[PDB]
Amino acid sequence: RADQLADESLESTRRMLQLVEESKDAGIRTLVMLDEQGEQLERIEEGMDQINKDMKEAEKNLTDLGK
Amino acid sequence: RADQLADESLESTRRMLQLVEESKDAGIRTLVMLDEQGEQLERIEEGMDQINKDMKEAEKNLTDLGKFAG
Amino acid sequence: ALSEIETRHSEIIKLENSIRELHDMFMDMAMLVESQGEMIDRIEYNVEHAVDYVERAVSDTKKAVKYQ
Amino acid sequence: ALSEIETRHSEIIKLENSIRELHDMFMDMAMLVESQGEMIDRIEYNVEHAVDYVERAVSDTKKAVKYQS
Amino acid sequence: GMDTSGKQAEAMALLAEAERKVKNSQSFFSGLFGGSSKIEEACEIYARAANMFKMAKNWSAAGNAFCQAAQLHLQLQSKHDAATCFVDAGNAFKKADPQEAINCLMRAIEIYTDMGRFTIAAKHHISIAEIYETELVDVEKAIAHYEQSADYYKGEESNSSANKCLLKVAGYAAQLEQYQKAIDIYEQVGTSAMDSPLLKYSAKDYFFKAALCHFCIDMLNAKLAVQKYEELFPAFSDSRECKLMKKLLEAHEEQNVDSYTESVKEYDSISRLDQWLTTMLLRIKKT
Amino acid sequence: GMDTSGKQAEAMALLAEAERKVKNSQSFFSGLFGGSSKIEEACEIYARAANMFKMAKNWSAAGNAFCQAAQLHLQLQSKHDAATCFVDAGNAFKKADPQEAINCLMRAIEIYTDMGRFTIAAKHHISIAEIYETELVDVEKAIAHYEQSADYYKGEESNSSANKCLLKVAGYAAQLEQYQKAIDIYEQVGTSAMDSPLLKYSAKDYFFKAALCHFCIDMLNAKLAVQKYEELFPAFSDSRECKLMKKLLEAHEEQNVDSYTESVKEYDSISRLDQWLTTMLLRIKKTIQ
Amino acid sequence: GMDTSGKQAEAMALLAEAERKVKNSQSFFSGLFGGSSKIEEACEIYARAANMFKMAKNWSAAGNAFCQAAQLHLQLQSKHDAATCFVDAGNAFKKADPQEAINCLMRAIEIYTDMGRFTIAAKHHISIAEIYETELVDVEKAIAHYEQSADYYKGEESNSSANKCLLKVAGYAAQLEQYQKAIDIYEQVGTSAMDSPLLKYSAKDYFFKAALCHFCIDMLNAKLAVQKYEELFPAFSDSRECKLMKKLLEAHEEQNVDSYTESVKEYDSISRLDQWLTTMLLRIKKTIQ
Amino acid sequence: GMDTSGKQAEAMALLAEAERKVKNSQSFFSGLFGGSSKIEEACEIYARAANMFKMAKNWSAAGNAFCQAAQLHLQLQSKHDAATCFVDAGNAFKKADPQEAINCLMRAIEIYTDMGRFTIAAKHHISIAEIYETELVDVEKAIAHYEQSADYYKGEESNSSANKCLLKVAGYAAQLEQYQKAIDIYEQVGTSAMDSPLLKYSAKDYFFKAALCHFCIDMLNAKLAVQKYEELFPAFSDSRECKLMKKLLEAHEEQNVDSYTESVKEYDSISRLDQWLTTMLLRIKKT
C-alpha cells in the first residue's frame, strides 16, 4: 500500500500549495498596511515639531513682555 | 536513475529545513518586537491627552481672567 | 531507499507543523497591526486639533496684549 | 510513473519560488518595523519635553501674575 | 441607568433652564450685556446635558442637543468648536436616522475647507461615502465624493490613500460598466508601484484585473494589450494569472465551453473566488 | 540598604514637614485666610513625599500619601488634579494591597464619566476587570465590568477592541453560565469580521466554538446549527476542524466511547488541544449514557 | 466649472486688495504710525488668497504669493513662519517650475540648519535629491545631497536612515562613478550587521555586491577578497552566491564563454534577476577576449 | 571642507564675543544692575555657538560649550533647559572622549530623578550601560546599571521593557561563572511568558537555556529540572530541544564523548549556533 502513501504525499503537497499561497497573499497586504503606518508617522512627527516650536516661542515672548 | 532521486531528495530536505527555520525565527522576533511599540503608543496617547486638557483649561481660565481685568 | 523515504516522511510531518505555525503567526500579526493603525489614526486627529487650538490661542492672546 | 515524478519536480520548483518569495518578504518587512520603532522613540521624547515645559511655564507664570496683585 | 434616564429628564430640565438662558438674551442681557461668557456657560450646560443624553442612549435627543449647541455657539466666533460639535452631531446621527448627518458633515467640510485642513475633510468625505454605500443605494454620489477626496489627498503627496480610494472607485465603476475609467485607474496604480521594494509584489493582481476589463470590450485588442503588459514586465507571464488569461483567450478562438469551464473550475480548485471576479466572468463569457 | 536607609530617613523628614503643613492648613483655614495657596504648597510637598516614597519601595505609604493629597486637593474646586492623584494612588495600590485600589479607581471613573472622556474610562474599567480576575477569586463582577467596557467601546465606534472584549466575556461565561449568551455573542462576532479581508481568515474558530456550545446542550439543534452555518458560509463545510464535528456527532449517535475517544485523540495531531476545549469534550463525554 | 471661475475672480480681487493694502500700509506707517499690524493682516490676506487659489487647481501664482508673503513676513524679524511658508511654496512649485522650488527649498534648509534642527534639513535634502534625479538627468549633485543627508543623520545617531542613504549613494557611484568608494561603503555597511536580531541573514547580499565590484576591477583582487570574506564571515562559505561566484571565476579562468553563459542562464532560471546585476555581468563578459 | 573652515572661523569669533559678553555683562550688572536679561542672551550665544561647533565637526569644544551653558543656566535657577544642555553635551561626548560623558549623563539622571520622572532616567541608564559595555570591560557597572533600569521599568508597570534588561543581565551573569541569578531570571521570565497569546511560541527557548546552565552543576539535578519543566509545560517535549537534552544526558552518563560531539555537530548542521551556546557546550564537555 505504498502507493497509498504516495497519494497521501500528493494530498499533502496540495495542502502545502494552499497554505503557502494563502500566507503569501495575507502577508502582501500586511506589507501595504505597514507602509501606510510609516507614511502617517512622518506627518504626526512634523505636527509635533511645529506645535513645540510655536508654543515655546509664544510663551517665552509673552513672559519677556510681562517684565 | 535512483542516484538523481537521492540527490534531489537530499537537496530538497536541506533547503526546506533551512528556509523553514529562517522564516520561523524572523517571524518570532518580529512578533516580540511589536509589543514595545504597542505600549509606547499607549504612553504617547496618555501624554497627548494630558497636554490637551491642561492647555485647554489654562487658556480658558486665562481668557476669563483677562476679561475680568478688562 | 526505505530509510530515505522514512526520513522524507519525517520531513513531510515537520513541514506540515511548521507551515501551520507560520499560518497562525501571520494571522495574529495582521490583527495586531490593524489595532495599532487605528490607534495611530486617533492620536493623529487629536494632535492636529491641539495644534489648531494652540495656534489660534496664541494669536488671540497676542492681539489682546496689543489692545493693552 | 516517471512523468509523475517529473510533475513532482515541477511542483517542488513551484514551492521553491513561493518559499524564496516568503523569505525575501520577511527580510523586507523587518527593516520597516525597525524604522517605525526608531521614529516612535523620538516622537515620544519630544512630546514628553513639550508637556513638561508647557506645564511648568504656565504654572509658574500664572502663580506670578495672580499673586503680584 | 433608570435614574440616569430620570436625570435625562432633569437634563431636559437643564435644557429648560437653558431656555431661560436664551430668555436672558430675550430680556435680561440688556443689563447683562457683558454676559457673553454667560452665553458660553449656557452652551457648556447644553453640551454636558447632551453628553448625559448620549449616556442615556437617546440618539435623536442627543443629536438635537448637539445641533442646537453648535448653532448657538457659532456666533461667528470659535468656529472650530462649532465644527467639533457638528461632527459630534453627525457621529451621533450615524446610528438611527443618518440623513441630516450628511448635511451637518457637509457644513463641517465647508468650514474646514475655508480653514484649509484638507486631511480631515477628506476623511469625512470617505465617511459620508461609506454611509451612502452601506445605508442608501446611490453610488454615483459616492463616486463623486471619492473623486473629491482623492484629489484632496493627492494634493499633498499622500499617494497611498489616494491609490486605495481610486481602486475602490475603479471597482465600482467597473460594476457600473464604464470600462475606460477602470482600465485607466488600474493601469496607473499598477505601473506606479513596479520599482519600490515594499509594494513590489502586488503588481500582478492589478494587471490581471485590468486585462479582464480590457478583454471585456475588444477581444482582438486584448492580445495586444497582454503582449504589451508582458513586454513591459518580464516577470508577468510566470505568474499563474497570465497563463490562465492566455488559455481563456486562445480557447475562445474556438467555440468550446467545456475548455473554459474546466479551466476556471481548476483555477478555483486552488483558491476561492470573490463575487466581483465570478460575476464578471459569468457576464462576459456568456458571449 | 544604606541608600534606602537614607531614603527612608529623608522620607520621615518630609513626613514631619507635611504634618507641619497640615498644621499650616488648619491654621490658615481657621487662623488665617487665603491658605488655598499655602495648602497648594502643602499638596506640592505631599506629592514630592509620595513620589520619593514610591522610589523608596514603601508602596503602602506612597499610596496613603497620594490618597491624602488627593482628598485634600478635592476641596479647591479642582477635579482634574483629583483624577491624576487618584489614578496614581490606584497604580500604587495595584501591588501589595489592591482592595482599596478598586474603590479609588471607581472614584476616578465616576469623575471621568462625569467629565465626558469615555475611552480612558473604558481602559480603567478593563484594568479593574483584569486585576479583579487575576488576584480576586470571583468572576461575575468580571462579566459585568467587561460588559460595561464593551458597551463603552462599541458606543464610540472603536469596533476592534470592543470585539475582543465581548469575545473574552462570552467565552468566559460559557464556562460557568448558561450557553445562550455564548451562542449569541459568538454568532454576532463571526459575521461582523467575515467581510474585511484580513481579520476574516479566522472566523472558522469562532463558528467552531459556537458549534461546541450548541452541541453541549443537545444534538438535534446542534445539527440544525451546523447545517445553517455551512449554508451561510459555504467555505466552513469543506474545512478541517469542521469534520471533527460530523465524525463526532455520528459516533455519539451510536453510543460508542472508543471511536469518539480515538477521533478526538486523532485530532490532537498537528494542534495541541488547549485547556478549555478539552474540558468541554470531557463534559459532553461524561453524559453519553 | 463655476467653482474654478469664481475662485479665480475672487483671487484676483484679493490680490488687488492686498496690493492696495500694502501701499496704503506704507502710507499709514508715516501717516498714523499704527505699528506693524497693517503688514500682518496684509500677510494674512496673502496667505488666505494663496490657499484658496491652490484649492482652485492653479499652482504657479499660488507659490508666487506664498513667496511674497514669506518675504514680507521675514521682513518683520519672524523667521520660522516664513520658513514653513517657503516649504509649502516649494511643495506647490514642485509641479510647476523645478528651479524656483529648488531655490526656495535651499533657503528653507539653510535657515533651518541655522536654527538648529538637522533632521528636517536632512529630510528636505532627500526631497531635493529625489526631485533632482527623478525628472532632471544628473547624478553628481544627487550624490552630494545624499551624502550631506547621511552625514546629518549620523550626527544624531539615526543609524538606519544614514545606512539607507549611504547604500543608495554607493549603488549610484558604482553604476557610474569609480569603484573604491563602493567597495568601502558596501563592505562597511555589510560588516556592520553580522551581530543583531533580524538584520543577521540579510547582510549576505551586501558582501556579494562587494565581490562583484572587486571582480570588476581584476581577477587577482577578486580571488583575494573572496578568500578574505570567506575567512572573516564563516556563513558566506555556504551561500549559494559563493558557489556561483567560484564557478564564474574558474570558468572565466579558462576562457570558455559557453560555461559562463550557461552558468548565468541557470542562475537566472533558478531565481529572477534584478536589472543591476545583469548589467555588471554583461560588462564582465564583454572582456573575455 | 571650506564650509567647516568658515564655520570654525566665525566660531572663534562668536566665542570671543561670548567671553566679552560674560565679562562686560557681569560688569554691567555690578555698575548698573540691568537685571538678568544679559545672562540669558549670553546663554543663547553659548547655545548657538555650540550648535555651529557641532556643524564644524569639532565635538570636544561643542561639549565644553554645552556644559558651560548648562552650568550657567542652572546657576540662573532654571533646571530643564540646563538638563537639555547637559544631555546634549553627553551626546556630543559619546564619540571621541566619552569618560566625562558618564559624569554628565549621571548628573542629568540625578536631576531627572530629583524631579520625579522615571522613564527617561531608565533610558539614560541603559545608554550609560551600553557605553560601558561597548567601550570598557568593567562589566560589573553594566550589571548594576541594567539592574537599576530594570527595577525602574518594572516599578512603572512597563512589563515588556523589564524583560529585555533582565535577559541581558542574565546572559552576562551566566558569562561570569555565576549561575543562581541566571537560573532565577530565566525561569521567572519563562513562567511569566506561559500565558502570553503572542510570546507563548518563544516561551520554550528561555526554558531550554536554563536547563543548559543548570546542567553546569551536576547531572541528576539537571534531570529533575528538565522533568519538572516538562510537567509544567506539557508541549515542551514536542520540540527537538528535549530530544537533544536527553541525548546529551544519556551520552554523558556512559562516557560516550564521540557520540556527544557528533550529535552536537548534527544539531549545528541542521541549524547553526552562536558564540554563547557553543562556548557553554564546550565548557560542559570539558568534564
PDB file of N, CA and C in Angstrom, chain E residues 157-188:
ATOM      1  N   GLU E 157       0.580  64.863  -1.649  1.00  0.00           N
ATOM      2  CA  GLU E 157       1.501  63.748  -1.858  1.00  0.00           C
ATOM      3  C   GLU E 157       1.200  62.532  -0.988  1.00  0.00           C
ATOM      4  N   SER E 158       0.031  62.468  -0.353  1.00  0.00           N
ATOM      5  CA  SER E 158      -0.358  61.279   0.404  1.00  0.00           C
ATOM      6  C   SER E 158      -0.887  60.256  -0.598  1.00  0.00           C
ATOM      7  N   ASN E 159       0.052  59.635  -1.315  1.00  0.00           N
ATOM      8  CA  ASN E 159      -0.304  58.899  -2.524  1.00  0.00           C
ATOM      9  C   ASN E 159      -1.074  57.618  -2.218  1.00  0.00           C
ATOM     10  N   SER E 160      -0.670  56.874  -1.186  1.00  0.00           N
ATOM     11  CA  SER E 160      -1.220  55.535  -0.985  1.00  0.00           C
ATOM     12  C   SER E 160      -2.719  55.572  -0.700  1.00  0.00           C
ATOM     13  N   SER E 161      -3.159  56.516   0.134  1.00  0.00           N
ATOM     14  CA  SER E 161      -4.584  56.634   0.419  1.00  0.00           C
ATOM     15  C   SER E 161      -5.364  56.970  -0.844  1.00  0.00           C
ATOM     16  N   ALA E 162      -4.838  57.892  -1.650  1.00  0.00           N
ATOM     17  CA  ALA E 162      -5.471  58.198  -2.924  1.00  0.00           C
ATOM     18  C   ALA E 162      -5.540  56.958  -3.803  1.00  0.00           C
ATOM     19  N   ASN E 163      -4.492  56.135  -3.781  1.00  0.00           N
ATOM     20  CA  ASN E 163      -4.475  54.936  -4.610  1.00  0.00           C
ATOM     21  C   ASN E 163      -5.558  53.955  -4.185  1.00  0.00           C
ATOM     22  N   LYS E 164      -5.706  53.726  -2.880  1.00  0.00           N
ATOM     23  CA  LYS E 164      -6.758  52.813  -2.437  1.00  0.00           C
ATOM     24  C   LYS E 164      -8.140  53.369  -2.770  1.00  0.00           C
ATOM     25  N   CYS E 165      -8.332  54.678  -2.590  1.00  0.00           N
ATOM     26  CA  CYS E 165      -9.612  55.279  -2.949  1.00  0.00           C
ATOM     27  C   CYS E 165      -9.903  55.094  -4.432  1.00  0.00           C
ATOM     28  N   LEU E 166      -8.904  55.328  -5.283  1.00  0.00           N
ATOM     29  CA  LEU E 166      -9.098  55.163  -6.717  1.00  0.00           C
ATOM     30  C   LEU E 166      -9.355  53.705  -7.071  1.00  0.00           C
ATOM     31  N   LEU E 167      -8.737  52.774  -6.344  1.00  0.00           N
ATOM     32  CA  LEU E 167      -9.017  51.363  -6.581  1.00  0.00           C
ATOM     33  C   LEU E 167     -10.480  51.046  -6.304  1.00  0.00           C
ATOM     34  N   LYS E 168     -11.006  51.543  -5.185  1.00  0.00           N
ATOM     35  CA  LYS E 168     -12.418  51.315  -4.893  1.00  0.00           C
ATOM     36  C   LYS E 168     -13.303  51.964  -5.952  1.00  0.00           C
ATOM     37  N   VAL E 169     -12.944  53.175  -6.378  1.00  0.00           N
ATOM     38  CA  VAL E 169     -13.707  53.850  -7.424  1.00  0.00           C
ATOM     39  C   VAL E 169     -13.711  53.015  -8.695  1.00  0.00           C
ATOM     40  N   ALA E 170     -12.556  52.462  -9.061  1.00  0.00           N
ATOM     41  CA  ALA E 170     -12.469  51.654 -10.269  1.00  0.00           C
ATOM     42  C   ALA E 170     -13.336  50.413 -10.155  1.00  0.00           C
ATOM     43  N   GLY E 171     -13.317  49.760  -8.994  1.00  0.00           N
ATOM     44  CA  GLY E 171     -14.175  48.600  -8.813  1.00  0.00           C
ATOM     45  C   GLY E 171     -15.640  48.943  -9.004  1.00  0.00           C
ATOM     46  N   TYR E 172     -16.086  50.032  -8.376  1.00  0.00           N
ATOM     47  CA  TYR E 172     -17.487  50.421  -8.506  1.00  0.00           C
ATOM     48  C   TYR E 172     -17.830  50.785  -9.946  1.00  0.00           C
ATOM     49  N   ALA E 173     -16.957  51.541 -10.613  1.00  0.00           N
ATOM     50  CA  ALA E 173     -17.224  51.919 -11.994  1.00  0.00           C
ATOM     51  C   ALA E 173     -17.305  50.691 -12.889  1.00  0.00           C
ATOM     52  N   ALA E 174     -16.390  49.740 -12.704  1.00  0.00           N
ATOM     53  CA  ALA E 174     -16.439  48.512 -13.484  1.00  0.00           C
ATOM     54  C   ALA E 174     -17.746  47.780 -13.246  1.00  0.00           C
ATOM     55  N   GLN E 175     -18.210  47.750 -11.996  1.00  0.00           N
ATOM     56  CA  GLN E 175     -19.544  47.221 -11.742  1.00  0.00           C
ATOM     57  C   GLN E 175     -20.603  48.030 -12.481  1.00  0.00           C
ATOM     58  N   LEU E 176     -20.325  49.303 -12.752  1.00  0.00           N
ATOM     59  CA  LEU E 176     -21.231  50.170 -13.494  1.00  0.00           C
ATOM     60  C   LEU E 176     -20.925  50.197 -14.991  1.00  0.00           C
ATOM     61  N   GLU E 177     -20.040  49.324 -15.464  1.00  0.00           N
ATOM     62  CA  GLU E 177     -19.701  49.178 -16.882  1.00  0.00           C
ATOM     63  C   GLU E 177     -19.431  50.528 -17.554  1.00  0.00           C
ATOM     64  N   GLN E 178     -18.379  51.195 -17.078  1.00  0.00           N
ATOM     65  CA  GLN E 178     -17.707  52.272 -17.809  1.00  0.00           C
ATOM     66  C   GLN E 178     -16.226  51.918 -17.773  1.00  0.00           C
ATOM     67  N   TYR E 179     -15.804  51.105 -18.741  1.00  0.00           N
ATOM     68  CA  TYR E 179     -14.547  50.378 -18.607  1.00  0.00           C
ATOM     69  C   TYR E 179     -13.327  51.266 -18.818  1.00  0.00           C
ATOM     70  N   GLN E 180     -13.443  52.327 -19.617  1.00  0.00           N
ATOM     71  CA  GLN E 180     -12.277  53.166 -19.881  1.00  0.00           C
ATOM     72  C   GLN E 180     -11.688  53.709 -18.584  1.00  0.00           C
ATOM     73  N   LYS E 181     -12.548  54.216 -17.704  1.00  0.00           N
ATOM     74  CA  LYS E 181     -12.093  54.758 -16.430  1.00  0.00           C
ATOM     75  C   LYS E 181     -11.412  53.680 -15.594  1.00  0.00           C
ATOM     76  N   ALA E 182     -12.041  52.506 -15.507  1.00  0.00           N
ATOM     77  CA  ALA E 182     -11.474  51.426 -14.710  1.00  0.00           C
ATOM     78  C   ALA E 182     -10.092  51.038 -15.220  1.00  0.00           C
ATOM     79  N   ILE E 183      -9.949  50.863 -16.536  1.00  0.00           N
ATOM     80  CA  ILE E 183      -8.656  50.457 -17.080  1.00  0.00           C
ATOM     81  C   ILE E 183      -7.611  51.533 -16.812  1.00  0.00           C
ATOM     82  N   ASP E 184      -7.970  52.801 -17.030  1.00  0.00           N
ATOM     83  CA  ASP E 184      -7.030  53.884 -16.762  1.00  0.00           C
ATOM     84  C   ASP E 184      -6.515  53.809 -15.334  1.00  0.00           C
ATOM     85  N   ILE E 185      -7.440  53.735 -14.378  1.00  0.00           N
ATOM     86  CA  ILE E 185      -7.058  53.776 -12.971  1.00  0.00           C
ATOM     87  C   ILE E 185      -6.197  52.568 -12.622  1.00  0.00           C
ATOM     88  N   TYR E 186      -6.621  51.381 -13.058  1.00  0.00           N
ATOM     89  CA  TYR E 186      -5.875  50.175 -12.730  1.00  0.00           C
ATOM     90  C   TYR E 186      -4.469  50.230 -13.309  1.00  0.00           C
ATOM     91  N   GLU E 187      -4.339  50.658 -14.566  1.00  0.00           N
ATOM     92  CA  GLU E 187      -3.020  50.755 -15.180  1.00  0.00           C
ATOM     93  C   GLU E 187      -2.138  51.749 -14.439  1.00  0.00           C
ATOM     94  N   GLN E 188      -2.688  52.914 -14.101  1.00  0.00           N
ATOM     95  CA  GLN E 188      -1.911  53.892 -13.354  1.00  0.00           C
ATOM     96  C   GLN E 188      -1.382  53.285 -12.062  1.00  0.00           C
TER      97      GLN E 188
END
